[PDB]
Nucleic acid binder design. Sequence first.
RNA 1: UAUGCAUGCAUU
RNA 2: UAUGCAUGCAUU
Lengths: 244, 244
Amino acid sequence: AERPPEETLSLWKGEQARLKARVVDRDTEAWQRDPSFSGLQKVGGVDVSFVKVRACASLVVLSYPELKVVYEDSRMVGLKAPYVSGFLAFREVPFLVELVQRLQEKEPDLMPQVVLVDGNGVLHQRGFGVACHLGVLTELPCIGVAKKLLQVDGLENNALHKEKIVLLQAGGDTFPLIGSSGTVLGMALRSHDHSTKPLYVSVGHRISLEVAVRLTHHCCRFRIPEPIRQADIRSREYIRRTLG
Amino acid sequence: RPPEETLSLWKGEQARLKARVVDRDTEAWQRDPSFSGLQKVGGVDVSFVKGDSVRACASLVVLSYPELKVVYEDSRMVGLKAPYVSGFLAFREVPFLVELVQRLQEKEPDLMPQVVLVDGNGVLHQRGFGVACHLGVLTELPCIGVAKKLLQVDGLENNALHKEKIVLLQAGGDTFPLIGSSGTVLGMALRSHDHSTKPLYVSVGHRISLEVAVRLTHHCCRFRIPEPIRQADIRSREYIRRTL
RNA sequence: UAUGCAUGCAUU
RNA sequence: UAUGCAUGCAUU
Ligand SMILES: [Mg+2]
Ligand SMILES: [Mg+2]
Ligand SMILES: [Mg+2]
Ligand SMILES: [Mg+2]
Ligand SMILES: [Mg+2]
Ligand SMILES: [Mg+2]
Ligand code: NA
Ligand code: NA
């Protein structure tokens, strides 16, 4: 528990709505319209791991399409805010932004052309999830990838939703997450043939949904897309090393 | 690591106690077609710390039969004396298991198990006297040896021929015998459950026959690990976890 | 996010 | 025996 008081959450909603105006949810890069993403060379992944305050934020850059790690920054940080659903960015985003800036100063040539974020983008209680939030503050193209369904605007992990997951039969299969507004907030994606629990993909910034879904699918060796998976693995391994 | 002084004293103690091993049935329930009269099955296990070579947690459970509900638990932090050396497991875990037995007699003498499943081999052992025999001779309780991987002794090998046989195990309860180079039947490979492929290696501990030990092990398997051993392992690791 | 359980692989 | 990875479930 130890949730922030309502007055703090209310300020945070205001900041989310203001920055939401800067979200670009269409494609803005030439590689995004290419059938094989020709010209996409560098994909980023971000994640924060915790000690069972002390955390480890990690940014990786992977080559495309080989998905090999060409840059890694794993940093020990002291997080301030607690996890509250719908306010993830207020916990993780200042440190992720700080990693991007560190990359710009150390290997600016490895700046990623797109970033996969461990959390939703517009599939979010106010249409402005951590993936949008990182995208607006860095102006990088960002994809939101979530591991379970954020239940917003009528979306629910109920029987009907579970029935659709049964229709996902092969790697790459999708179905749209249709809000009560008639808006398509994201896609359920089956990562590969040997996984049944879908990923929940939504636009972060400067990318379209169908391109974000197709790209996430291409990063999936395992259920978790390789940029996120490598940041998660390396950040947790970094904690273990400086034993905790 | 122990000096050779201790090592030879250990080969000697094992041969000395081997003379008391009874590898036939001595309890009326063992001859019963449905094990009528068997009411209490024990399981023993010790968990270790990743950090401490010294600290360990030994646990003993007693389960009702045939419901397999835990009716007794004793979990104890202990100071290990010997390191793990293959073939001498008892000299590392068995003094603490004997102490758990003695404590049960003093606390709940009515829940004294009629048989004990041991996480480790019985007569399937470099000197025909594994930890399960060792506990059986020191307590005079009937004991079953259950191993999760094959102790390669007397020509037994986890080679291509052995792996073919494992493929021949098709359902829960399927078995094949483990024949040493002497032609002696040291144990049985048992498919524990329909939804596991990895066999158990079951051998006689004390005061039971192999056919009965195999059939009882199978009857205790909710999952791949027999429920008495499985419950001791879970409870002993949880105890280490909550003291870390 | 961390942890537990299940099934398998690897290391030991 | 502990850890890591994989797949699923649960708690959060
Ligand atoms: Mg994360
Ligand atoms: Mg993570
Ligand atoms: Mg054990
Ligand atoms: Mg164990
Ligand atoms: Mg995690
Ligand atoms: Mg273990
Ligand atoms: Na390319
Ligand atoms: Na009974």
